[PDB]
């Protein structure tokens, strides 16, 4: 929340890394099928998308 919105410099969510993976491909990459993981993976995914 701070990185996306701060007066000095804002990291936009659409930037892609060397592989081309956006923040959402990266969040899928760490995604696992354990409850402890999915519980926050889905939350952060929805947060960033909205």
């Amino acid at each position: 929340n701070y990185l996306t919105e701060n007066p000095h410099k804002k990291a936009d969510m659409r930037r892609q890394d060397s592989r081309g993976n956006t923040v959402l491909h990266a969040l899928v990459a760490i995604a696992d099928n354990t409850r402890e993981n999915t519980k926050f993976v889905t939350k952060m995914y929805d947060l960033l998308l909205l």
């Binding site: 936009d12 659409r14 930037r15 892609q16 060397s18």
Partner: protein
Amino acid sequence: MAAIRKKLVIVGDGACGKTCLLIVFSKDQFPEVYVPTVFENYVADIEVDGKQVELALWDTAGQEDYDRLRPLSYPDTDVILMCFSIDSPDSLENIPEKWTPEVKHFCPNVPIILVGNKKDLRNDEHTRRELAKMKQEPVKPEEGRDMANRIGAFGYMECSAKTKDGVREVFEMATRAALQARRGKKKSGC
């Protein structure tokens, strides 16, 4: 839209204006008192054709202990400006001899722009007399064009840091060459 990050690296003999070229590109103000041996950790914003590119400019010097750490800058390099001095003919002939094979060795299939700096000094009386003392002349544009054809250069321009002549177009063409993603693979193994 989303700026694309491209890696630009400078390799040339000392005192040919590489650092000053990057500096004039960066702040557009010629430093008349202090010039660092290297210009480091900078990213500049440039737009050429509807695309917005952040160019990360690395710099390589060989004066003292930097040569040992030079190879480390070559990985993930997207585009190179091989630079030499117009008012110093000794710079040209070493480009095929020593600079080119190291560039090919560490990072092949990369675009390269061969440039000659400080157009003002070729017509300068002092430099002309100094070169004539050894029966020499400033690097002719024809020789630079021939070299650019000779060693596979993507383009050949000339810069002038003091007068800020042609820097914008030079780096524009550099990033235009960088944005091209080569041509697949050649003789790729079965």
